Amino acid sequence: MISLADLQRRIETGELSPNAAIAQSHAAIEAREKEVHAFVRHDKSARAQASGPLRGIAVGIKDIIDTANMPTEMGSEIYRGWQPRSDAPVVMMLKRAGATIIGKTTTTAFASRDPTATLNPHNTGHSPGGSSSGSAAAVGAGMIPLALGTQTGGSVIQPAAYCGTAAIKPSFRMLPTVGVKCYSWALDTVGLFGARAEDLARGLLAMTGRSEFSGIVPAKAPRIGVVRQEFAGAVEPAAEQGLQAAIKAAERAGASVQAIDLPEAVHEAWRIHPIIQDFEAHRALAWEFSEHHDEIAPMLRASLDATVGLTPKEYDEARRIGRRGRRELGEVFEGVDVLLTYSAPGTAPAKALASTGDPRYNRLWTLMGNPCVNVPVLKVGGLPIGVQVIARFGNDAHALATAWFLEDALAK
Amino acid sequence: MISLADLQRRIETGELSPNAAIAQSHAAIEAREKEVHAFVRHDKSARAQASGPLRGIAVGIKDIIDTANMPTEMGSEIYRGWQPRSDAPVVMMLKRAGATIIGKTTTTAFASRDPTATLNPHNTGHSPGGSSSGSAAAVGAGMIPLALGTQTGGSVIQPAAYCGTAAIKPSFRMLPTVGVKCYSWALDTVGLFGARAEDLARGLLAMTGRSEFSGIVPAKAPRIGVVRQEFAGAVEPAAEQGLQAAIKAAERAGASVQAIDLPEAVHEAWRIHPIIQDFEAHRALAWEFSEHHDEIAPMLRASLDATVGLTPKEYDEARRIGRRGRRELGEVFEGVDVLLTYSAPGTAPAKALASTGDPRYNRLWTLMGNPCVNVPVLKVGGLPIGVQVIARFGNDAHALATAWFLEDALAK
């Protein structure tokens, strides 16, 4: 994996040139695309920019995010050849900082469950996760130092964990979803994939200019609360293997680790996430569902079909529960600086299973809105396993800091 | 003006066929458009649907709202001939209910301050307000029974008042902003224009299927609190004349009216609205500002150029201020059912002034999120004057009921 912060430093000290950095990404892509299929399209003519903290940094954009110079096909035949007139605001944040939009990474149809052709970098016979399949896979394959994706269920954290890359889903609404194909406006949150927490941090700084992302250093003696999300069901062994490895490494590094059960109000929040997501999806994809029903990928078509009956009333009730959830979640953070849990059910599923993987350990947080970061921990049978670091809402900075700490802790 | 609730009833009993209803609108549009200039595009082939609560109901759509069968030019040369791929979700809500999208109404450039060529229905020498110029002018001229617009500052209520039509800016985020050109994602709220409060209710019921909009009837002896928003300065004579006429009609109708002072936190929220709005404006229009700066309409270009320096810091500070204002604003609604204030600074400005009007008496409420309803009161020199009925967040039904009440009261 290529490190964004690394490139920045080397480029900044004239040790490395922006054109060399971009040339390298093009090289890496060509080196593995016929193997990973992480790009819907690759702009080979992309060149480094002359100025900005991200000059010489190649970035892949999930194909549900608008680009003015490249098609944005939403991973659906319905939008084959579709060309947005403008770049999405998040894309402009990158371009303005000097970044190079090297290509559009694969996305499942409308960011749902229908698998793409992308394969896991660590094992061509396994899925790279979803829906940000291409972004995670591309970063995990060492093709690019940065990639943008989105999360509604767990499409940022989960795929990153499956591909063994660092990733973050900032606090809800921090990054605008303007020009980002909507699934659920109550949940949709843009995310970033990188090699390490530090890369994520620098990436966010360049995009937002928010001082909180400036000069972030590994956290010291973090106060951690471990939650195994019992309400989410039975976790796979490999996943628990990573969480224990992470807890152990953090304890050696000075972290205080105490297990804690999440309030009932939160369990309920996790339960009603589907209701909120699916009710809004029918509104958000009304044009597609009504005019191009049969053209909607199988899995997505099936879940929408199964939920055409959700009512505004039970939807309103779900949102009430959701709010109860946030209110009582904040209290849990009075005694701990962050929470540590699974980033996925286990190792990435074989491709033959025809599944991107169950986001049950990710969805609650997307609804609560807190910033989440995936920290690669270990590998089982060659497939990566990570843990998810979660901080108080609006505290992305500290989430990246502790994630960093965890990375260093794991490195012994 | 054309009443949606009336057509709906006559079509229901069979007295009027959907086809004849749409023929009515085409004719009404045909008879006044050449002088009002309210439509960017009039689809003369638009026909009625055979079913749905809105069958035979023609609706005008502000041109920053995506439509699949008609261009969406954002009131800007930059988007000349721009054709969205899909109908925006709010449009689909109308279509699915049986309504007919008869055309795209004029919108100022990217819904900002640069005037459109539309003229006030009551006096062609005056502005119809903005930025939803076309929707207001069209309904006010009796061309169509319903129209959609948007409000970031006061773009729904103010132009509604200027053109003497009923209108409602629903609770923030009730109606999705997907497919709606964004200005400020923390403010943008879709709104409706109609003959009376009741026509708004029927439209919302049909669009959302929410029970709170079903069976709405005029409120009885409503508890009203009058707020003159002193923080925004004194209003023009005509505006105060209408408010005084509304209070008297209300009292004489059985309502308890009391002058209320707004919590200081609220005054502050009004003060920082421009910071949240203008800061996000820069992220939401980044592509336009960077790639087509000179093509941006004069006024918008100047306001953008003047706010380039706004920082994430003062931005977050403004957001916090807005949240505290919302809290205390809710407190106010513990003794009163609705607030009664001004809809605009006075009568519509002369076109010669090249201004759509100052939204200072509207912006606060858009930031607070409360549902507001304009109620035409009287005219001065032939120019309409209205008042604004505001209920608590989530009490759209009550806002319409009280507005309906106030309408009867004014009709004595």
SS (H, E, C) B365-389: HHHHCCCEEEEEEEEECCEEEEEEE
Query: Would you state the structure tokens that stand for residue B31, as one six-digit string?
Result: 């008879």
For CA atoms A138, A142, A143, A144, the dihedral sign is positive
Residue B235 vs residues B229, B239, B342: alpha-carbon distances, Å: 9, 6, 8
Residue A206 phi, psi dihedral angles, 5° rounding: -55, -35
Question: What span, in angstroms and rounded, lies between the C-alpha atoms of A167 and A187?
Answer: 17
The 3-state secondary structure of A30-55 reads: HHHHHHHCCEEEECCCCCCCCCCCCC
Say which residue the tokens 């019921």 belong to: B205
Q: In B, residues 130-189, which contact A (CB 8 Å cutoff)?
A: 173, 176-178, 182, 185-186
Report the C-alpha gap between B111 and B89 in whole angstroms: 19
Q: How far is CA B209 from the centre of its chain?
A: 21
Q: Indicate the DSSP class of residue A212.
A: G
A99's tokens: 């970044």
Q: In DSSP terms, which residues pair with B42 in a beta bridge?
A: B103
Q: What are phi and psi of A400, to 5 degrees?
A: -70, -35
Contact B126, B350 (CB under 8 A): yes
Nearest Cα residue to A46 out of A74, A18, A66: A18
Report the distance separating Cα B44 and Cα A300, nearest Å. 36
φ/ψ of A85, rounded to 5, equals -75, -30
Extract the runs of DSSP E, i.e. beta strands, from A64-215: 100-105, 146-151, 166-169, 189-194
Distance of CA A140 to the CA centre of its chain: 13
Q: Quick one: DSSP state of residue A295?
A: G
Angle, CA of A294, A296 and A299, to the nearest 5°: 110
Q: Which of A176, A208, A283 sits opposite B284 (nearest CB)?
A: A176
**Quick check: A74 and A181 in contact, CB under 8 A?**
yes
Interface of A with B in 299-328 (CB under 8 A): 311-313
Q: At a CB cut-off of 8 Å and minimum separation 6, what does A221 contact?
A: A254, A255, A256
Distance between CA atoms of residues B224 and B73, nearest Å: 41
* Sheet containing A256-259, strands listed edge to edge, beginning at the edge strand earlier in sequence: A39-42, A100-105, A58-62, A146-151, A189-194, A166-169, A372-380, A383-391, A338-342, A223-226, A256-259
Q: How many CB atoms lie within 10 A of CB A334?
A: 7
Question: Which residues on chain A are in Cβ contact (under 8 Å) with B209?
Answer: 311-312
- For β-strands B256-259 and B223-226, DSSP reports them as parallel
Q: Which residues contact A39 (CB under 8 A, 6 or more apart)?
A: A29, A33, A60, A103, A104, A105, A106, A134, A138
B68 shares contact with chain A (CB less than 8 Å): yes
CA dist A401 and A255 (Å) reads 13
Rounded to whole angstroms, how far apart are CA atoms A187 and A189? Answer: 6
Query: Measured between alpha carbons, how far is residue A313 from residues A170, A289, B125 in Å?
Result: 30, 22, 47
CA dihedral B156, B159, B161, B163 (to 10 degrees): -130
AA identity, residue A128: P
- What experiment produced this structure? X-ray
Q: How many C-beta atoms surround the C-beta of residue A134 within 10 A?
A: 34
The helix/strand/coil state of A246 is helix
Regarding beta strands A383-391 and A338-342, do their DSSP bridges make them parallel or antiparallel, or are they unpaired? Answer: antiparallel
SS (H, E, C) chain B: CCCHHHHHHHHHHCCCCHHHHHHHHHHHHHHHHHHHCCEEEECCCCCCCCCCCCCCCEEEEECCECCCCCCCCCCCHHHCCCCCCCCCHHHHHHHHCCCEEEEEECCCHHHCCCCCCCCCCCCCCECCCCCCHHHHHHHHCCCCCEEEEEECCCCCHHHHHHCCCEEEECCCCCCCCCCECCCCCCCCEEEEEECCHHHHHHHHHHHHCCHHHCCCCCCCCCEEEECCCHHHCCCCHHHHHHHHHHHHHHHCCCCEEEECCCCHHHHHHHHHHHHHHHHHHHHHCHHHHHHCHHHCCHHHHHHHHHHCCCCHHHHHHHHHHHHHHHHHHHHHCCCCCEEEEECCCCCCCEHHHCCCCCCCCCHHHHHHCCCEEEEEEEEECCEEEEEEEECCCCCHHHHHHHHHHHHHHHCC
How much of chain A is helix, strand and coil, in % rounded to 5?
40, 15, 40
Q: What is the end-to-end Cα distance of chain B in Å, rounded?
A: 20
Give B284→chain A minimum CA distance, Å.
6
- A93: tokens are 């944040």
Q: Nearest 5 degrees, angle CA A304-CA A307-CA A312?
A: 120
Query: Which residues have a Cβ under 8 Å from the Cβ of A256 and sit 6 or more positions away?
Result: A221, A222, A223, A224
Within its chain, how far is the Cα of A379 from the centroid? 19
Name the fold adopted by A1-412. Amidase signature (AS) enzymes (3.90.1300)
Count CB-CB contacts under 10 A for residue B214: 12
Looking at the complex, does the CB of residue B82 fall below 8 Å from at least one CB of chain A? yes
**Which residues face B58 on adjacent strands?**
B100
Please give the sequence-ordered ranges of beta strands (E in DSSP) within A141-239, or none if there are none.
146-151, 166-169, 189-194, 223-226
CB contact under 8 A, A286 and B208: no
B210 shares contact with chain A (CB less than 8 Å) = yes
Question: What b-and-e string marks burial along A136-168, b requiring 16 or more CB atoms within 10 Å of the CB?
Answer: bbbbbbbbbbbbbbbbbbbbbbbbbbbbbbbbb
How many residues are recorded in chain A?
A: 412
Residues 6+ apart with CB under 8 A from B294: B301
Residue of B61, B28, B309 whose CA lies nearest to B207: B61
CA–CA dist A162, A130 (Å, integer): 9
Separation of alpha carbons A383 and A345, rounded Å: 13
Write the CB contacts of A131 (distance below 8 Å, at least 6 apart in sequence).
Answer: A62, A64, A75, A107, A108, A111, A112, A113, A149, A150, A152, A155, A159, A356
Interface size, chain A vs chain B, as Cβ–Cβ contacts under 8 Å: 82
Where do the structural domains in chain A lie, given as residue ranges? 1-412
The answer to whether the CB of A111 falls within 8 A of the CB of A329 is no
Contact call for residues B256 and B224 (beta carbons, < 8 A)? yes
- Calculate the dihedral angle through the C-alpha atoms of A260, A320, A183, A388, rounding to the nearest 10 degrees: -10
| CA–CA dist B188, B88 (Å, integer) | 15
**Alpha-carbon distances of A242 from A136, A338, B178, B195, rounded to whole Å:** 19, 17, 39, 63
CA distance B259 to B242: 16
Q: Which residue from A243, A231, A174 is spatially nearest to A389, judged by alpha carbons?
A: A243
Does the CA dihedral A195-A201-A202-A206 come out positive or negative? positive
* B223-226: strand order across its sheet: B39-42, B100-105, B58-62, B146-151, B189-194, B166-169, B372-380, B383-390, B338-342, B223-226, B256-259
Q: At A313, is the secondary structure helix, strand, or coil?
A: helix
- Determine contact: A393 vs chain B, CB below 8 A: no
Do the beta carbons of residue A169 and residue A370 sit within 8 Å?
no
Closest Cα in chain A to B90: A283
Q: How far apart are the first and last CA of chain A?
A: 20
* Resolution of the experimental model, in Å, one decimal: 2.2
With CA atoms as reference, the chain B residue closest to A177 would be B185
Query: How many CB atoms lie under 10 A from the CB of residue B23?
Result: 15
Q: How far is CA A336 from its chain centroid?
A: 24
User: Cα torsion at A349, A355, A360, A362 (round to 10°)?
Assistant: 80
B388 - beta bridge partners? B341, B374
Which residue from A96, A280, A287 is facing B286, i.e. has the nearest CB?
A96
Distance from CA of A97 to the nearest CA of B (A): 12
Beta bridge partners of A62: A105
**Residue of chain A minimizing CA distance to B183:** A178
Among candidate residues A371, A373, A405, A406, the one with its CA nearest the CA of residue A391: A371
Burial class (CB in 10 A: 0-12, 13-18, 19+), B314: middle
Contacts of A163 (CB under 8 A, 6+ apart): A120, A121, A122, A128, A129, A136, A137, A139, A140, A141, A348, A384
- B92 to chain A, any CB pair closer than 8 A? The answer is yes
Could you tell me the CA-to-CA distances from B409 to A64, A343, A387, B161, B258 in Å, in that order? 51, 60, 63, 18, 17
Residue appearing with tokens 């080196």: A31
Closest to A278 in 3D by CA, of A396, A113, A100, A122: A113
Q: For testing the chain A interface, which of B61, B70, B92, B174 should be mutated: the one with the most A CBs within 10 Å?
A: B92
From the candidates B283, B310, B316, which should be mutated to test the interface with A, based on the most A CB atoms within 10 A? B283
Q: What angle do CA A119, A125, A128 make, to 5 degrees?
A: 35
- E strand segments, A20-135: 39-42, 58-62, 100-105
Q: How many CA atoms lie within 13 A of A356 on its CB side?
A: 31
- State the DSSP H helix or E strand holding residue A160, giving kind and residue range, or none if neither: helix A157-163
**Single-letter amino acid, residue B336:** V
How many beta carbons lie within 10 A of that of residue A233, not counting itself? 10
Measured between beta carbons, which residues in chain B are less than 8 angstroms from residue A312?
208-211
What are the tokens at B213? 């909009």
DSSP A141: T
Query: To 10 degrees, what angle do helices B264-284 and A89-96 make?
Result: 70
Burial B148-184, CB ≥16 within 10 A → b, else e: bbbbbbbbbbbbbbbbbbbbbbbbbebbbbbbbbbbb
